[model samples]
Target: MVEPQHNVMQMGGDFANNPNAQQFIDKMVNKHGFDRQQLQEILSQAKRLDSVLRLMDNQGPNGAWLRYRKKFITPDNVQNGVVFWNQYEDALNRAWQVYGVPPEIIVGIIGVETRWGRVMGKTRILDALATLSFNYPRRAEYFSGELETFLLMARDEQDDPLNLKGSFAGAMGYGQFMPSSYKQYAVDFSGDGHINLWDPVDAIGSVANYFKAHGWVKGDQVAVMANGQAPGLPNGFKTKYSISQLAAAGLTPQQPLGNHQQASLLRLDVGTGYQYWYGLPNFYTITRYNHSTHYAMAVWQLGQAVALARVQ
Candidate 1:
């Protein structure tokens, strides 16, 4: 009798035509011993373009960003964040001790991702990933890779591929981790055999692990508001630069610190032309989550706000 876990292996279809897909499946099956039938079943359930378009229309960039901002900066969210923080205080503290990642940042990431699990996503993970992988031309290759990874992860966890649900972009669980991130950083913090990102404790540990793996330095400031722009502040400073380079170019923050410390200059528009900030190494590490300075800044500031409210 085929085990329940092996049932998903029987579901593969047209993806066989894609050489990359075939190669990946071969790698997983031959090298990793992943069940081919399970991989096929997961890919077969992937959603089409129409479904992706529908979700994208519903989640327009402006609308999505606004909703994200509002959801993250509410009294209810703040209260919930504190409650969740207290609930997992031990795990948070332990992660901080072991990984040198601040609990506030970890908690804030969860708060931003899913409102502390109050909302973990409604779309099926397979459908969302498949939709983006096959339908979204802009990032089809990347999403397709994630789809491959998702299948591998489902097999690893002995999960039913069709049973998993996540965001439109296929990020799952309380931390909104992409399939690759989930596989790489998610941990079995509760001593269970499987990593459970849906659980607060596991999510907390995973967030800290992600940060540490990405080079988060504890006790180091993430960013600080700049006082004024100095002379010769280079335009198009979107890419990262060393602190010495920025200072040498006359772009320094209000509160002067060691000139030797590495930092990057960031500019954000808050109604006026643009507001500047100095981002330290830890700040750069936050950028790894989304690869956007604006997103990183928002996460950092909101994390600080959430942490302060929790303490009070």
Candidate 2:
């Protein structure tokens, strides 16, 4: 989804002029054996993204589940997910057996995030990553680390760093992984001796690996709508609480559960009101991918939708 647009520029000086950029170059050269001159020249082309900050500041539906679901869990998405899973059944099943993350969930995540590779962003990675790492203060440290990881990836792949296109936040591949994720979790599922996320086989395996690394439990429920009164879950808490404790908090599950089991109670906005859900450890694990209760629900539910469709 990377778009390298050299057609225009909103340049805010060169990364060559930034102290952070200089340090990055030095770190790559002295510690990592990168060509100093080449990295310097690369920094020279890094453009500051003044508008990216504004986009980051307002990228939500303000916790409205319905609003978010309509975007990712549409009939088209579900149908496409079913098609994608069928198209890659061999690799998907292999990942399911190896990682214990079901195929539908993997398909669901990609379907939700990128619509089966139909909507990966088009921003040139170097420009966006450099601008954020050096110029943006809100997440400079995090993005700086990502910038370093990206350079390492580019070196390892022996690819032109300038040619890499991705999200404005610097995520790459069909799975939309950031540089650090690509370094850590990407896999070569196609037996091609490459860990390219653009390959569906690799993207499928990498998504499974990420879920497995984050502790996705096979055969576990991701979430369930609470019956009757909502649970008085602790505000903004991400930790696990006992099912018995949830019952005590006035939330009843639609199905029976072991009293000793732990779960997270989520109260999500449903347009004008609220809806409650029992979020299992698996649900919390899904949030590791995107860190949103709503995002987890979309992935889980989309899987459910696709799975149900497959049977029919």
**Window of ten residues with lowest summed lDDT in model 2:** 4-13
Instruction: List model 2 lDDT by residue over 213-276, tens digit each.
Output: 9988787777777875553556322857777777787778887664427777787777666777
- The TM-score leader among the candidates is 2
Q: Ten residues in a row with the worst lDDT in model 1?
A: 60-69
- Model 1: what TM-score? 0.79
Against the true structure, candidate 2 reaches a TM-score of: 0.89
lDDT of 1 by residue, 1-312 (tens): 756575443345544345555555666688677767656655665555466657665751133334445646778877777888888899999999988988789877888778888789888887777667655667778887788788778878878878887787788898888998987888987778888768788888888999999999778777766766643564322555666777666565776655436556776655434566777778778878877765676576667777888778
RMSD of 1: 4.9
Quote each prediction's TM-score.
Answer: 0.79, 0.89
